[PDB]
Amino acid sequence: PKSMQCKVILLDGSEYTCDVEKRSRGQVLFDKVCEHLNLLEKDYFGLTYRDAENQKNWLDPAKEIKKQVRSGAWHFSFNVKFYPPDPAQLSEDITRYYLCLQLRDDIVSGRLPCSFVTLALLGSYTVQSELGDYDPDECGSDYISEFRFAPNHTKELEDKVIELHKSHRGMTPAEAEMHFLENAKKLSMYGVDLHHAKDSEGVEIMLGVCASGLLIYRDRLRINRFAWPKVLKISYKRNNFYIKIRPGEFEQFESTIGFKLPNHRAAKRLWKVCVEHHTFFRLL
Ligand SMILES: COc1ccc([C@H](N)c2ccccc2)cc1
Numbered sequence: 233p234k235s236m237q238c239k240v241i242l243l244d245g246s247e248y249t250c251d252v253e254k255r256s257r258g259q260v261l262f263d264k265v266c267e268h269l270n271l272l273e274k275d276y277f278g279l280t281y282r283d284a285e286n287q288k289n290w291l292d293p294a295k296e297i298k299k300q301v302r303s304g305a306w307h308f309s310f311n312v313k314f315y316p317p318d319p320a321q322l323s324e325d326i327t328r329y330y331l332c333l334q335l336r337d338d339i340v341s342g343r344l345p346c347s348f349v350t351l352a353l354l355g356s357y358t359v360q361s362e363l364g365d366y367d368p369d370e371c372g373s374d375y376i377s378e379f380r381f382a383p384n385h386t387k388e389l390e391d392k393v394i395e396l397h398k399s400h401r402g403m404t405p406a407e408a409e410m411h412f413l414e415n416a417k418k419l420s421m422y423g424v425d426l427h428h429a430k431d432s433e434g435v436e437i438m439l440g441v442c443a444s445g446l447l448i449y450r451d452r453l454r455i456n457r458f459a460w461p462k463v464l465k466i467s468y469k470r471n472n473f474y475i476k477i478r479p480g481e482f483e484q485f486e487s488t489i490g491f492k493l494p495n496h497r498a499a500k501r502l503w504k505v506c507v508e509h510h511t512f513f514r515l516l
Contacts, residue, residue, distance in 0.1 A: 236297070240265050240279065241309040243333035248310075252297065259293035265310055273327040275512075278313035289501065290508075314512045315423025317443045319413040325406040332358070332409050335416045342383040344421050352389055354412055355381035356396030361408040366398045425509075427502045429473065430492040439473075439491065441505050443513045446475060460513060466506045468499040475506075 235251040238261055242248055248268055252260045258279065266274045279291040281301050291300055291308060312334040322328055336358060338344035339351065346354065358379055363370075376390050400408060416422060424440040424447065431437050431450075440447035446463060448456040458477060464486055465476045471494070477487045493499040 236306050238297075238306045238308065241307075242269070243310060243330055243337070254298060256297055257293060257295060258291040258297055258300065261297060261308070262291070262293050269310070269330065270326060271330060273322055273324055276312055276314045276316060276322075276327065277330070278311060279308040280311050281308050283497070285495075285497065287497070287501065290505070312423075314509070314516075315443065316516070317417065317423075319417060320410065325409070328406070328409050328413055332361070332412050332416075335412070335422075336380070339416075340380045340383060343426075344416075344419055346382070346419055348389065348392070350415060350419065351382045352392035353396055353415055355379065355389070355393040356400060357403075357408045357412040357415075359393060359397045360400040360403045361405040361412070365401045365403075366394070425505055427498070427505075428494065429502075432490045432492075434492070437491070439502065441502070441509050443509070443516075446506065460510050463506075463510065466503055466510070468493075468496075468503040471496055471499055473499045473502050 234254045236254045236256075238250050238252060240248040240250075240261075242265075248265060250261070250264050250268075252264070262274070262277075262279055265279065266272075266277070271277065278293075280288045281291055282304065283289050284303055289300065290313060291297065297306065312331055315331070315334075316322060319328055319331055322331070335344065335354075339346055339354065355377075358381070359377065362379070371394055375394060376385075376387075377393065379393075381393060382389055403411070421440075422442075424442045426449075427439045427441070429437050429439050431448075435450070438447075438449035440449060445457055445459040447458075448454075450456075458475065462478050463475055464478055467474045471492055473491045473493055475489050477489060479486055493502060
């Protein structure tokens with residue numbers, strides 16, 4: 233029985249190596265990684281790989297790994313797939329911990345924009361969780377943390393993290409992580425998966441997929457939101473992605489909004505993440 237070496241980038245930035253049989257489905261590898269992480273609330277997470285066009289793809293746990301990675305390396309990342317709107321409802325602290333690590337990367341990467349004050353507050357909870365109570369002995373007037381907090385660090389930001397850290401004395405890691413999440417969950421881009429697209433006129437937009445529905449990001453005076461219930465069907469054809477939008481009560485017919493994606497693979501990717509989000513948040 234022939235086994236393939238898998239390398240998985242974990243949310244702490246470390247690399248986990250394991251083997252699976254070469255005809256293994258994604259679920260096999262995912263189960264191994266989750267056991268390694270002592271993670272039980274697995275439904276919110278997934279593995280990603282980079283395709284031949286270097287796009288992030290979710291590893292489908294139901295399909296053979298080899299038919300997804302195809303010509304590429306068996307190299308993956310462990311990631312949050314479904315960001316819970318209410319992380320306080322998660323059963324386990326360790327689930328909230330992995331969600332925090334994901335969100336820290338979302339912030340540093342600039343995928344999750346955040347005000348100065350919220351960057352400093354989130355950073356102050358991370359420090360409290362990781363180091364415990366504020367200590368002046370490690371932190372002088374010239375202190376810069378090893379913790380990456382933001383896409384662009386300033387001395388201002390470092391000072392504000394310390395000021396807020398001082399206020400968190402006696403806070404345990406689980407408590408600090410829960411505060412981190414109570415703040416992060418409110419950010420307008422929390423758990424929004426963004427896709428580049430053109431509207432039916434050829435104007436460049438962004439489509440965002442998240443718990444509440446589908447968002448269209450245009451000129452920035454116009455953001456359209458379609459709650460999952462208002463979305464009757466989702467489809468793709470060639471480079472095109474279509475959503476059918478329910479009639480307003482006493483309307484005879486549904487409306488169709490068409491979008492142009494970069495290529496067929498990008499349209500299929502968007503369709504699959506929309507279907508998955510619609511199912512997940514319909515049931516949650
Ligand atoms: C992490 O976010 C959630 C997790 C579980 C639920 C679940 N359906 C529920 C609803 C109501 C009361 C208790 C459990 C809901 C949200």
